[PDB]
Every structure is written in structure tokens, then in C-alpha cells.
Design a binder for these strands. Structure first.
Lengths: 121, 92, 50, 130, 97
RNA sequence: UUUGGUUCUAUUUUGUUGGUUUCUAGGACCAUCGUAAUGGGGACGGUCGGGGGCAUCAGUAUUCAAUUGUCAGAGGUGAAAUUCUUGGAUUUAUUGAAGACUAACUACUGCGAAAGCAUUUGCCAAGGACGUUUUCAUUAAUCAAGAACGAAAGUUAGGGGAUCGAAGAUGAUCAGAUACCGUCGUAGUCUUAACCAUAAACUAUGCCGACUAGGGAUCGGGUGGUGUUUUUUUAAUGACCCACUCGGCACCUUAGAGAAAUCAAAGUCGGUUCUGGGGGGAGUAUGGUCGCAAGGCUGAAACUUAAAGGAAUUG
RNA sequence: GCGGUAAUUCCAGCUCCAAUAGCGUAUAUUAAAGUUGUUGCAGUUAAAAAGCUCGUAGUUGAACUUUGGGCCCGGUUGGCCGGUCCGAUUUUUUCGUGUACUGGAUUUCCAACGGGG
RNA sequence: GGAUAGUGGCCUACCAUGGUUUCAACGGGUACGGGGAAUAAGGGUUCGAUUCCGGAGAGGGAGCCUGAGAAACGGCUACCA
């Protein structure tokens, strides 16, 4: 039903893997790729496509947390007065643990990386 | 850690006495002098204290001025920003 | 107990706890003792008019 | 957490509120539960608006119930994905005496207490119909 | 409902068991701070008089007695009048007022 | 799964054991042939703010200072005095350095997990909103122990130190004041470094989820309808006429509950944890852990009492 | 809480009576006391919401099953006697005694079952 | 390996350094454990005992003969009370 409506609107299977496929190989951004086009076409992808193989995604969540952490770590080293911000460092790093428990259970190498992937990347 | 409980750092030298406050200061400056510091130039965690106020990089061999105990302080960093603020405005 | 006899009920073991005195207990009691309204009678409703 | 408890309480409060009907989201154990009660005729029917390919699933429940009062005097959740009561076949505590039934979820399918004795049974009580 | 927990499983339900034990207000296994015992016979040789309470008045005649199960406390004498001699051994009930 | 091979198993036809070799099922090794290997949070675009840290910058004090000018008071309160005061004050004008705070603005107001946070202004970087239907497609939800932050005031090193300001100094009160009241005054207030782990940390309402009444508009965005102000005249908005949605807010305000007073949940009966004990003894003893210490956490007994308490009434 | 002089509570005997070959009193224990709450209770002001958070060992399980089957269902298989319950009856009676019957959680092994977690 | 009627760090050589415990181990205190006893409508609390059953003793403790069987109240050895 939901998938069928978009099937009439778009154009057709085979073509849709190729259109999406380019943007992803360029550099990640599953959400981005997806807002381009020709949306009526892109709309079908969850509804029909399994979801592609990709670098990043499970890693993205951790990657961003570490990205943010380093910047805040300078602001904790300088002046101590930072009472609000510090908890945020504690929230983000930790939001990565919180995701890390379920995300570890289907695949291999998420277990080794995810522990390590605080304060490295 | 060590076989230590709290944290001596230096303290064992003293033996027993000296007191919490006195030994704490003497711990802080020297243990932070010892702490691996990145050289500005290479970026390797080279810097060691050659002497009081003398800092040297093991890799590059550039030697630099700084605090006696620590490579750097807050104070020195404040001075550098204000001169730069003055300098910027004059230049435009 | 006296209240039960007059109600024209002979035997009911009614576990009233949580309070000593008396006007509040007597005040509580007409209220289960007037609205009955729960099953079989509920089925019996259908029929109307004055 | 669940949705199941919300269903029993929303009907009982509504009977008191005096209303045309109910709408709520259904959920998976919650749709399975409902049907049994109707069969004993506490409720005329229910229909889920959009049974197929939909995010939530929402159930419009046809009430039995006003005009004058109702049918389902009290639906009060004892367990209903709430709290972890247990019943044995032999150990049957229940309120009401008789006028009312108990719903047990069992290995076989659902049913009333009285039918459940004829099979034998046990499970966990969902709620008490008085 | 129920009780707070669902009785769901996997090493739960254990928490409430701890609460019952901490919590029991009165005196525990028996009491023998001082005391009990159906006759505990103290031989006493102090006869004295103590006061009573704040809102009344009166002055009871009492006799203090030293117990076999070592303790000296004030004991009340029941009945009107009394005489009590050599020690003697007078057996006490140990009721609470 | 069908169909053949290659290795293992393999009574055997042989009294017998024996030496020597396949194929059939099963297992193994496979080729042929013939079907699957599968699905709250984030992401992008975004907006507010008083989210935090640093810098910049303003003014408005008073003190201090420099200077004016000029007499006999000023200061302060119920009343006074202490104080200040002819060596020229104070009040007054202007200018500088210092100097703490952000009046007016700031509102039933907004934001941070909370504690809290308010000059404008810049720099780095977070977070909740919406709107998307992109990803995990229910991924989730709470949690003793663990760990993090945690006002103020204490504490400690070092800089600054204006009014203020315990303690403490004189004065008045007054029977007594170490009191309120007045003057004076130090650590403190403040800054960077490091500790404290507590408050009437309050929304006296732990936190997560479902339903269950409306009503006035407040802020953010989004769907806008509509035109106007308002700009400019293709055109789109900051506010607005005028609805709707989403999240918080709070009041106004339900009736089933709430002792109650009240609440709209503290309602109808949830997920989960901590924790309660009649009051005084007691958030105390003792031991442990932690802390520089203050003290904080953890945590009662002999004993004593016929009450403590809440709310509502009538004096 | 009675006794500050005409005491309904002392002290003496009449009377009234609960109970009655027993009776209360003390101690121990339990009910009531939903006052250890599972059934059966509180945390705005009653003792009591942890200041708040980040997470876990451990509570729970998001739109109609299908395999397996531990928790599930459905039928059979053990618990001494004594005591407890139901009756004969037996000792002049009777409790005792006495016979016979009826029930027993739990666990074992076993047909069969598939909502849920 | 030895031992014993027979399990076996029960005991003992050598090699391994282990194994348990936030689901409570180790440790401390408690005015036999089960079958059962009274409560109370049920639920649970309480009680665990003299009797039945199994366990442990004989003033305290260790060892040993005899005998099928004893680590023995009515056996010894023998220190101590």
C-alpha cells in the first residue's frame, strides 16, 4: 500500500539503485541522498530496497561524538568555571555507550571498535 | 596504579611529614613539568625540562622559554592574546 | 450490626476498616445500600416508559 | 511502556465520562486481548482503522453503552500487561462471586473462567470484569 | 493493582525480602535487655517510696529489690498494706504499666 | 532436493579365517541440476535563548585622587549619641584610576540534565523545538552498586581589594544588650588554581509511558487563510487580522479522586527505583569509608511518654 | 483516669453478674494491627520522592505467527504412622480407643499443547 | 601412586596457580533438620521440640582391640576435670 503508491509515482527498479548509489560512494550521508532528485522517486527507497551496503553509519554515531568531544575537551582544560558544559561531555560520550550495547550484538568488529572509539577518532 | 593508595607523585622523598597543603603544591608543578607535552613545532610528545625555565624538545631540538615548573601557564597565554588584540586593531 | 438488622439483611460480614467513629461509618453505608448497579439487573434494563 | 493497561482504564473512565465511543492506538498483545470480552457481550465490536501497512494501528471501539448505562460495569486491570499476578487451576481467588468472569490468558487460546475450568487451566488474569 | 514489581523473572523479586528484616520496630528475639521471666525472684533489702506522675499526686509505697539475674530496679507492691522481712525472696511478675 | 564419482563404513559367496576389488543407503568429499541467505534514538535542513568558556565594550556609583569654589555644619534616627568637623569638612562642578554590578530593561518571562544563568558585542562548540520519512524500524524504557556535575558558606595558595561586611571596637536602649537601632571594621564578597558534597537543591510534587474537560494568550517553529500596517511595486517578510498543529509554560478553571486545603493530575489502575516507620532520645552513639579540616555519608540502644502530628472548624 | 469529705472506680458487707470444677493473672506467641502490606498500605502538608543526571547485574517488552518448547495447557504415576476432617461404633458413658472413608501442597517420570515471554 | 568394603587433595609426590563472590561466597551471631504443631476465613506469620524419621553424644578430647557391623553410656588405652 504505502510502497505501491510510490511505485506508480517514480520510475523503476534497477534505476533507483543506480541513482542513490552514486551519492553514497562520494561521502556517506544516507539522509542527504535521499533529499535530492525527484523525491517521489527517492520516497520508495525504505519501502523497497533492503538498504544498501555502505561504509560508516554505525560508525557515524560514534565518530561524531568523538568529533564533538575533542572540541569540548579544550574548553574543560581552560577555565574551570564551565559548570554546565562538563555534563554535556558526560552526556555525549555516554550516548555513544548507550547506542553501543545493541549495535554490538548483530555484527563482529563493532565490539572491538566501539570500546576503543572513545577518544581516538 | 602503583602499589600506592592516594597519590604521592613526589611525596616518598619527604618520607612522612611536610603536610597535605605544602606537599601538594610541590607535587603539582613538578609532576606537570614531567608530564609529556607536545612541542609546538613537531607535535611529538617530546618536551622535557632542561633546567628551570628551559624546555627542550627531544625530537626537534628547539629549545624554548616557558614557566620554570610548567612549559607554559595561563598567564603567558593571557599576555599573548591581549598584544595580538592590540596589534589587530592597529593593523586593520 | 444494628444497621444490618434494620436493612432487613440478617447476615453480612462487612469488613469496615480504617476508622473508629461513627457518623462517618453511618454516612458511608447508605451509599452501597442504594445504588446497586452491576450485572444481571444491567441485562434486565431493556423496557421503558413511565 | 505498553498500551494494554491504557485500554482497560480508558474504557472504565469513559463509561463514567459518558461518551460516544473510544479511539486509541492498538498494539500487538492489546488487539488479541480485546476480542474475548465482546464475545461474552461486553462490547458490540471493534474495528482497527487501517489494518494494513501503517505505522501505529488505531482501533475505534464500538461501545455497548449509552443510551441508558452500559454492559461492562467495571474493567479494572489486575495484570493487563501491568502486574504480574499468577493463577493456578486450583488457586482461583476472584472478586464478585458470580455475576462476573475472569479472563485468563492460557496455552490454547483465550476464554472465560468458567469455560477454563472445563478445560482446566491457568495463566495470568488480565482484568476483572465485575 | 498488584504489587509494584510484575513478578517478571530473571533474578528479581529479591528486593522486598531485605525490607521486612531491617524494619521491625519492637524488641527482637525475645527480650533480655532486663527482662522477662514468668517468676524471677529478687531478694531485696531497700524499702523506700517514689513518686507517681505529673498530673495527679499520690506517694506509693514501693520496695526496691535486687534480682538473682543481677539488676536493682524499683518494684511496686500490689494489694493494700504489706510487711516483708529478713530478705525475703518476693517473686515478680514483670508487667508493664 | 534429484542424478553420478572419490574416501569411510561394509554380515556377505566362503566351516573357517584369510589376501585381494566396486557400487547402494548413511557420514564425508563433491560435480550436475534445482530454491533463500531477508526488516526511543539518530541523521539532514532548521530556530530561540539570559545553554557554557574566553575576549571585547558601555554606563551609571561611591571611594580614592586631582581641582574648583566657600561657611559652620555634617552624619543619623523614635529620640539621640558614637562618628565626621575649623589644620577649611560636607554638599557642588569637572577629570582620572581603581572598581564591583548589570538599574532602566526583565514580563504568570525564556533556557540548562539539574545547581543556575541577564551590559551590549565577537570568537569555538553543545542542546531541546519543528519540518523531513532518510536509518536502526521498534531499535526501547528505568537501575542499588559504580561515575559525573552540584548554590552559598567554610577551607587553602597566590593576585586584586571600591562600597559592603561577621567577628569585634566605641555609642544609645535598657534592669541587662554580647540585641534590634547607628557609626566603624577584617577575612569574606570577587578573580585563576584546588577542595567541601550540603541547602526551604522547592514545582515541599523522584523519573519513564498510556488515557482521561474545556477556556483566555505567552514563546519558539511549521501548515497557513487573508489582507493590512510595512517595506519595496516580479516579489517576500519583523510585528499584526485570523485559525490550526507540535513541545514547554503557567494561570483560569472540570467533575472522579483527594483528610483536607486542594489537583487536573496528586485523576483513572503503568513501567522502574530509592525509601518510610508513634513522637522525644536521634539523623545521635559506636565502628567503617571519604575529607586538609569543618563535617558529610552510612546509622541506633537503654530509657521515657498517652501522646507527637496534619487539615479543617467554633471561640 | 478515680480519692481536694455527703466517691458509680478506695476500704467492709449487701445486691448484680460474667463465668463455673473452673477461673483470671503473668510470661511466651498469634490475631485484630492492611502496624513488614503477596492477598493487605504510605511518600504536596501525615514517618516518607533519593538534588539531579550517565549507565548496568537485574524488573518490563513496540503492526495479525511460523519452527523449537524452559516458563505455558492437558491427562496419568508419589507423599509412613500419628495428628487434622467425615461416620460405625467400643469400654455403664465418654475423651481416649477404635475401624473404615476422604482429602495433601510440593517433586519425580510420561501422551499432548504453541497466545504470551 | 598409596589407602579403603568402595568416591576421591581423604593423605601424598610432581606439574598447573588456581577456584568463589554485587544471584551475597568468607566470615560473625542465633534466648538439631524434616515429618509436623497452634493461628487465622484465606494468605502468610509463628514454631521446629519431648513423640515418628534421620543426624550427632555420653564429664571434655584423641586413638584402638574385639566383632559381620562399634570409632562404643552398660569396653579399653590414657592426658586432663
Amino acid at each position: 500500500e504505502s510502497v505501491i503508491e510510490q511505485i506508480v509515482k517514480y520510475a523503476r527498479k534497477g534505476l533507483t539503485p543506480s541513482q542513490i548509489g552514486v551519492l553514497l560512494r562520494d561521502a556517506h550521508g544516507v539522509t542527504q541522498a535521499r533529499v535530492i532528485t525527484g523525491n517521489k522517486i527517492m520516497r520508495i527507497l525504505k519501502s523497497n530496497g533492503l538498504a544498501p551496503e555502505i561504509p560508516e553509519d554505525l560508525y557515524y554515531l560514534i565518530k561524531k561524538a568523538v568529533s564533538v568531544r575533542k572540541h569540548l575537551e579544550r574548553n574543560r582544560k581552560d577555565k574551570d568555571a564551565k559548570f554546565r558544559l562538563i555534563l554535556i561531555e558526560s552526556r555525549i560520550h555516554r550516548l555513544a555507550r548507550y547506542y553501543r550495547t545493541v549495535a554490538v550484538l548483530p555484527p563482529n568488529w563493532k565490539y572491538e571498535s566501539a570500546t576503543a572509539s572513545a577518544l581516538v577518532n | 596504579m602503583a602499589k600506592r593508595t592516594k597519590k604521592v607523585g613526589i611525596t616518598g622523598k619527604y618520607g612522612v611529614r611536610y603536610g597535605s597543603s605544602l606537599r601538594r603544591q610541590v607535587k603539582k608543578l613538578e609532576i606537570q613539568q614531567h608530564a609529556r607535552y607536545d612541542c609546538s613545532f613537531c607535535g611529538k610528545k617530546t618536551v622535557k625540562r632542561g633546567a628551570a625555565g628551559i624546555w627542550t624538545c627531544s625530537c626537534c631540538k628547539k629549545t624554548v622559554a616557558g614557566g620554570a615548573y610548567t612549559v607554559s601557564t595561563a598567564a603567558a597565554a593571557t599576555v599573548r592574546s591581549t598584544i595580538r588584540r592590540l596589534r589587530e586593531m592597529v593593523e586593520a | 450490626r444494628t444497621l444490618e438488622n434494620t436493612l432487613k439483611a440478617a447476615f453480612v460480614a462487612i469488613g469496615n476498616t480504617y476508622g473508629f467513629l461513627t457518623p462517618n461509618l453511618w454516612a458511608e453505608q447508605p451509599l452501597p445500600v442504594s445504588p446497586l448497579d452491576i450485572y444481571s439487573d444491567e441485562a434486565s434494563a431493556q423496557k421503558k416508559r413511565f | 511502556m505498553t498500551r494494554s493497561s491504557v485500554l482497560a482504564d480508558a474504557l472504565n473512565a469513559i463509561n463514567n465520562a459518558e461518551k460516544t465511543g473510544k479511539r486509541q492506538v492498538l498494539i500487538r498483545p492489546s488487539s488479541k486481548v480485546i476480542i474475548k470480552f465482546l464475545q461474552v457481550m461486553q462490547k458490540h465490536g471493534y474495528i482497527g482503522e487501517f489494518e494494513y501497512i501503517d505505522d501505529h494501528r488505531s482501533g475505534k471501539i464500538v461501545v455497548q453503552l449509552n443510551g441508558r448505562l452500559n454492559k461492562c460495569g467495571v474493567i479494572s486491570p489486575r495484570f493487563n500487561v501491568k502486574i504480574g499476578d499468577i493463577e493456578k487451576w486450583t488457586a482461583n481467588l476472584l472478586p464478585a462471586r458470580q455475576f462476573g468472569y475472569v479472563i485468563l490468558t492460557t496455552s490454547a487460546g483465550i476464554m472465560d473462567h468458567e469455560e477454563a475450568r472445563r478445560k482446566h487451566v491457568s495463566g495470568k488474569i488480565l482484568g476483572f470484569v465485575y | 493493582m498488584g504489587k509494584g514489581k510484575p513478578r517478571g523473572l530473571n533474578s528479581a523479586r529479591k528486593l522486598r525480602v531485605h525490607r521486612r528484616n531491617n524494619r521491625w520496630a519492637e524488641n527482637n528475639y525475645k527480650k533480655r535487655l532486663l527482662g522477662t521471666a514468668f517468676k524471677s525472684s529478687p531478694f531485696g533489702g531497700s524499702s523506700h517510696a517514689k513518686g507517681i506522675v505529673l498530673e495527679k499526686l499520690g506517694i506509693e509505697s514501693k520496695q526496691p529489690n535486687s534480682a538473682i539475674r543481677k539488676c536493682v530496679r524499683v518494684q511496686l507492691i500490689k494489694n493494700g498494706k504489706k510487711v516483708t522481712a529478713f530478705v525475703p525472696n518476693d517473686g515478680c511478675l514483670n508487667f508493664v504499666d
